[PDB]
Structure 1
């Protein structure tokens, strides 16, 4: 990670209100991004924030930490998908400010149902199944609100792995514009 005159490259980007979601989403990544969003709001509550997304997703709860923080703060959080947005990464891509969700032409967007595990007694498995099913209902309802697609459509389209191009993601309502070279 190179230095620029004294900032590391990512910290220099943060000076211009740019946050990097460039890894698998766990609690540590969520804690950092939430802290960055809170800091940028405190500096200036009016100016836009830019969330770079190159992520395969990961933890749903960690994703919702980022999601809820985005929606609470006053500044518009722009989202731009560069490389790939999968699973909870694509959920956060769709969570960006209305009209300011982007993807570069060859960026990959994938949507699919949440993954999990359960082990032990029948009633413990039932509790785990009800939890992940309710979690999917929560994700689908919000994605419906964000994309303009129905919950029934999102349910069917996320049953298996569903890879989308940048243009297909725009047509779906996950992003607003495919950002072309000027």
Structure 2
């Protein structure tokens, strides 16, 4: 991870331009860092746009929602830019960017899918874990429906299995607003 002297690491230097880089799985540690960067940038300037680059296979649903809620909470618009792949919770966070300011680069991939879970132990414990997983899937689908303009029924059907979208397909689906095509 290289140093820049004006001593910043490369990410800290980009943070100075209100750029946040998500290039990993989403766990509580990654969520904690991204939330902290969003709170920091809001404290520096409550009006100016933030840029969230997303190259992520996803991870913890609750970690994702910590980032999701922080984005909607803060005053600044958060632009989302997909490079490489936004899968699972990654695609959910891509769709969570400011309306009109969700992008993918032309060869970026987007993948949508129902969440996974686990339940072990007594029949009564499995019933509680199963009810929580079902309610969480309904929450994820209602929000994706609101963010994309697709019906709940279509989101449910389209996320039963792994669903791979091109950047153009993701724009058609309403997960992003535009494909950033080369301009220079």
Q: Which category of TM-score, normalised to the shorter sequence, fits these structures?
A: over 0.9
- Stretches of structure 2 lacking an aligned partner (at least 5 in a row): none
Any idea what the Cα deviations from partners look like across 1:87-126, whole Å, max 9, x if unmatched? 0000000000000000000001000000111111111111
Q: TM-score, normalised by structure 2?
A: 0.98
Root mean square deviation, CA, Å:
0.5
Any idea what the Cα deviations from partners look like across 1:3-36, whole Å, max 9, x if unmatched? 1121110110001000111110000000000000
Distance in 1 (alpha carbons) for counterparts of 2:94 and 2:144: 10
- The alignment partner of 2:150 has SS state of coil
- Stretches of structure 1 lacking an aligned partner (at least 5 in a row): none
Shift of 1:54: 0.3
Shift of 1:173: 0.2
Distance in 2 (alpha carbons) for counterparts of 1:129 and 1:161: 21
- The alignment partner of 2:182 has SS state of coil
Distance in 1 (alpha carbons) for counterparts of 2:66 and 2:146: 18
Distance in 2 (alpha carbons) for counterparts of 1:163 and 1:126: 32
- The alignment partner of 2:169 has SS state of helix
Any idea what the Cα deviations from partners look like across 1:65-84, whole Å, max 9, x if unmatched? 00000001000000000000
Larger deviation, residues 119-128 vs 97-106:
119-128
- The alignment partner of 2:164 has SS state of strand
Which 4+ residue blocks in structure 1 deviate beyond 4 angstroms?
none
Distance in 1 (alpha carbons) for counterparts of 2:149 and 2:117: 27
